[PDB]
Amino acid sequence: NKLNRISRQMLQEMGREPTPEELAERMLMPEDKIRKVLKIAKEPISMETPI
Amino acid sequence: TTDPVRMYMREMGTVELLTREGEIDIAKRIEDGINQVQCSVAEYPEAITYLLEQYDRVEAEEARLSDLITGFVD
Amino acid sequence: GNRRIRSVGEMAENQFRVGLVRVERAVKERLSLGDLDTLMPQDMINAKPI
Amino acid sequence: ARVTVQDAVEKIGNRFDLVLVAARRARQMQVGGKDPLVPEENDKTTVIALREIEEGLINNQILDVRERQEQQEQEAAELQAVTAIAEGR
Amino acid sequence: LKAQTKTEEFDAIKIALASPDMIRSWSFGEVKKPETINYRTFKPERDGLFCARIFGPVKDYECLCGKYKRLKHRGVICEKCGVEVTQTKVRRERMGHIELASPTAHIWFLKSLPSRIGLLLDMPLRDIERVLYFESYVVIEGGMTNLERQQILTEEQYLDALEEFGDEFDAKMGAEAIQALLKSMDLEQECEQLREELNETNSETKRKKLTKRIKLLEAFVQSGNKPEWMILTVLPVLPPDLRPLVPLDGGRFATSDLNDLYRRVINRNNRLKRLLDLAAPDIIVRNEKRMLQEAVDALLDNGRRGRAITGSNKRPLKSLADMIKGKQGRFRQNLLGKRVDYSGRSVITVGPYLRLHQCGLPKKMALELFKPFIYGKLELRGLATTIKAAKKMVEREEAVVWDILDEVIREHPVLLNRAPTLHRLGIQAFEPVLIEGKAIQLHPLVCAAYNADFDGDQMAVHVPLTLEAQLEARALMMSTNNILSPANGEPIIVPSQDVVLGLYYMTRDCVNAKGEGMVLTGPKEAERLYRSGLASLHARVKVRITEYEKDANGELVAKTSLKDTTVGRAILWMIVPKGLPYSIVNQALGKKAISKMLNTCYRILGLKPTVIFADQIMYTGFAYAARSGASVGIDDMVIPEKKHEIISEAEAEVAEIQEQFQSGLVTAGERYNKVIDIWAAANDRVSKAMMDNLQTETVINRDGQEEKQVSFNSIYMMADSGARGSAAQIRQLAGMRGLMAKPDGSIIETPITANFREGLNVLQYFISTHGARKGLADTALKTANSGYLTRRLVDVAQDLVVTEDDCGTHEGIMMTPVIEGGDVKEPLRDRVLGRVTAEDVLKPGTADILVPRNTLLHEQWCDLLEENSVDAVKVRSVVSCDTDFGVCAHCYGRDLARGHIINKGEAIGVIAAQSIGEPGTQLTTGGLPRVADLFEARRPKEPAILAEISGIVSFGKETKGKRRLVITPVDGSDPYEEMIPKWRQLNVFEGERVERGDVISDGPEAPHDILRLRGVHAVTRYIVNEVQDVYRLQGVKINDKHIEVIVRQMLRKATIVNAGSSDFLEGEQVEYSRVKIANRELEANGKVGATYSRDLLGITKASLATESFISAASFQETTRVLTEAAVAGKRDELRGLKENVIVGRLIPAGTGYAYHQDRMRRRAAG
Amino acid sequence: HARSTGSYSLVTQQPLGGKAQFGGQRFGEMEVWALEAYGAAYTLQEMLTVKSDDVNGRTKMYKNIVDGNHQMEPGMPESFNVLLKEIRSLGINIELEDE
Ligand SMILES: [Mg+2]
Ligand SMILES: [Zn+2]
Ligand SMILES: [Zn+2]
């Protein structure tokens, strides 16, 4: 959630969107964890998705 | 109309909203009820001696004070 | 005479129009409670929606 | 090659039992239990079996007879082995 | 002897309701938590939808915790976390369950169109739903107080009733109530009472529903199912691997929607369990119970209530019913229908060198196709050390492997298939020939059966792995074994275009040519004359020929003579085998004659001689056509010299009629038709002008001044020979083309006066577009429509197969020539050919039997019938065959790709449907929709009416909207009076006697009548004659046999009239019934036998009834079929085709027919 | 395209190209009728059982092809085997009777 909040302001604040490492300095933790945390956090895709 | 959202909205809407005074009425009723059971528990001989046998286990290092009482008045 | 021809220009305008209505609800929502001189036309208008 | 099986169909009327019978025979040759009854031209067992039908030396009756014969050919070997199982008593 | 307990080979199948304990039997554990995977280590969380303990190890033979990793340890249940180490395959099998707090309704039995719980309790649906949502109270086992057993009460009413009677009265609400109702219900007692009540009151409204309900109940009793089971105590969980969580690329996960659904059902359930121990108020636990009900319903079949939507995705999540269901019915065998190994495909080309039994196969395709054969053969001879080394060899493509492939290819047929498979010739077996290049080469003669052009169509290849498949392919699906269309005995291998243009140019004659008049010893020196350049290919010459006639007894006679012929025909004779007379090659050999040549060759010398003959014909056709140097130039299209004048004269006509309309002499409409007529006549005028000029204009000289013969101009030869082109298309090239039609369907009164050799101006082309556009559209849509027709047909027939040999009934239908209005729109010889006589037929005198009782009528017998004047022959048909549950071969006919009588066990239903369906592309009241209406039995819009009973009729009463007609039979009772609306103009004479089935008005008649009033043979004759009219108008040859088998399926059911065993009005199988009254005719009751009435069902309606439910779940609506069967505990025995295909065993026909037969007798036996 | 033995779909075991070595040709319903019109039973069984849907029958077959024994030990297509569990996942008890 903390990341979404930053990504919201920083979306228009930066005019593009914060770089994958941008919110990392803003956030307390080791800041490389953005990749790991962002991955497992994703919701699985419906296997019934028509393609 | 099925769609259980509706059969809830309509089932609870029957219950009338409490007045600010009515709230204390119900809350007062609670106190009487519980105090009855508290008093009712106090009237059982086995209920005391058991608590005794439990604290004797507490002083014997067979249990901990956190697993028996949450504290007294105070 | 009853068959009209659209094309990229006309179609994109509609989508941009749709973007502006879904942003409209937001702008009014924020301007509802807004404090006087702190916020400006940035904190309201987002990018991602449009 | 065998271009048309018509002659085999004459020998056995049904033409489906032909597929069955020719199959049963074709496996007798492919799994090595036996050898061809008629000169093999490099024809695979599929076609060798069909020539055997055309020449009228193989069909359902003959095979059942031969197999029924082979049953007694093995029962003769094992005759002592299985009678030695008198330990059943 | 003991039966068995472990794995045998099952027959039949049974379906029924599941007890809670029965559901627990399958379950190897209860899923207690919505958790899926651990979220870091992706291992399954224990007691969750994915669980190693309940379901199975994630990886093969390995404990979850990892303590026992060794393949030796197998039956060990780990002491730490219980996981029996076994293949991960077992996670695809083991089920689970969930113990629900409150009972729950099964959406299938609540919401199926005939609500099962509703009519089982004789209770309306809206009430039952009102009780499930806790919206009212329902009584149960009311006792003697105030209240009905099924009566529904409200809040206040329940309260009042309870204060008056505390006990001896009971009421509940919600799922628990319904379950209490079903358990309390005594089926036996209700049955008896309902039987009495049925008898007492006579009303159609009353007893219709009555009989429906009683049938279910006694069925449900006999089923073994107990009503309570429609209310779910335990809920089974599907094995995890059937709804997998498997990872994807980029580390994302994907999972089935069931998880999202299943998860929900658990949570709500668990919460309810919690809410019981928390003593929540009623209003809450009630809402939670409803929420549980919604989740379970959504899980089973989504879309019957709210249509729950999946997490974060708008699209509604697919539920378990939608996994079975689909379009249409089941996905598994329905189109389409599973991918198959050992296959391939590519663009196809010609390969004229091929013999008819072989086909060109690209090198690379064959290598990858036969890879296992190649591997095994390489190390059988020892060219490869082991299978791996063999793989490296073919992967290296070492030169030595190609010769090994020639071994595995030699005798090993392959299957070829094209895109729209219609009749059985859509797949045919060939012997593979290794070919460099990536294109498949296909023998030209086969190109007709496939309807495969060379404009880039692609074909698919299949390898017949099993030995039985090689021999099936060689003895059934092989090219040479099907040379004849199963629709009609005419050869389908008929030479196509280039070949027939060759033979036409070969046997033809001009007036004066090199070598004219000379004489030669024999065909050998005839070719020597031609090839050397001495003699022209076509010149009139006498040569000695040796022909043969087998007219002796199985013996070929020989006779020699000097025949007056040409050089080409002399050369061609070298190919004609043996017993054919020279008369067959002495003509001009057009495409029509060249087919009857091959046909006769087949019906005389047999199969083998015809094949090699056919090959030779193709080779020589292509070859000589190439010598001919035929071409098409722009000066090859000759326009009449009189065209411009014809246009002008017809142009005066239009201005005459126009002048008549300006002066009012003729009305506007009358003008239009007139002008249109003169232009049309003009087109005919120009057509028959250019046709005369084009056809004969060759004017040449032999020794005299002049003479004129049929033109040698290129385009005429094409159209004349039968190669390609026709008078219609030719007319468009040279003469003017047509009068096109404006989109609304009218035809423009200013035709296209130009043609393609000249230019079309702007307007003319633009008007041409609609015809083109409507042409393309019509075909592209009607193509799909045709397929649909075959679909309904194969569904209504299918399982029909030749079973007995001879059923032995004298019955049959009378075959006469069609004799429509002119002379003989189709002869007698074609109608009776290849069929079997019903009874011996007389000469004009008698005690002389020409054809003796039941005999296959072949070419000689039909000609013997033609020798004598015999105009009518009664013939056994598949509609009259006495065999029950099939057709006897004696009643069918000979027809096949082979001339012999149909074999025992061939499946006629499919080939019947296919034979009718394949030509359906060429059709366009009248047309293809007319056919569909016929087979659907549909009663027309403004039908006629037939006399109900013979005897003198008269008019009675007056005009109420029906003016009654009163019939008066001579001997019998009068009372029949039918109410016919009198505003329809009548026919029947008020004072004349009309036989039953006479014309009481005009207009079409419903075939239902024809069956009822005129009889079985009459209606079958009506269908066949009407549908054959439709097809024959387009030029489609389809033997009446096929139409008859569809007809037999149309009448499969009949409605009983009398009684003494089964129910009065039940529609039921005439197979079952007739076998039942034939069994009753002796033994049993002396005769209690019941009378029926044959019924006519449309094709789509007759396909509805099939004993096997697995078949019905395929093409019908899956949900209804499964339920309606599950209540009765119906036991499907297979025995049919559709069902056996689903389950994947031998078809109970053809090669498989021996198996099922041998098993069927083992069954119900000792 | 040509395929001997390729990859297989996970949910239902069926030929699927994953390597760009294309999945096998699609054998349709109409083609089944074509086999039903011919007397060819074994080609049809092998078509919809061992050549495709039988996760066991396929390997038992392949091993026989190299051994030189042309046979099939068919078993049950996994598609139908799934339909049984899917039906059984509902309240329907579906069993295979007799012998
Ligand atoms: Mg094309
Ligand atoms: Zn363990
Ligand atoms: Zn019969």
Coordinates of C-alpha atoms in Angstrom, one line a residue, chain E residues 50 168 184 247 259 366 471 503 526 545 671 745 806 833 835 848 896 1011 1018 1037 1079 1085 1136:
Chain E
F50 CA -3.7 -27.6 -2.5
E168 CA -48.1 -32.2 17.7
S184 CA -40.3 -37.4 6.1
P247 CA 3.7 -21.0 -12.6
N259 CA -10.1 -21.9 -6.8
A366 CA 8.2 -38.7 -43.3
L471 CA -4.8 -53.6 -42.3
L503 CA -9.1 -38.9 -74.9
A526 CA -1.3 -48.2 -85.8
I545 CA -8.9 -55.7 -84.0
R671 CA -45.2 -3.6 -70.1
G745 CA -34.7 -9.6 -56.5
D806 CA -31.9 -61.9 -43.4
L833 CA -30.6 -51.7 -59.2
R835 CA -31.6 -53.9 -54.3
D848 CA -42.5 -68.6 -65.3
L896 CA -20.7 -50.0 -51.5
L1011 CA -48.6 -41.8 -42.3
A1018 CA -47.3 -44.4 -48.6
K1037 CA -27.6 -38.6 -58.0
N1079 CA -43.2 -62.1 -27.1
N1085 CA -50.7 -64.0 -21.5
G1136 CA -23.9 -47.3 -29.3

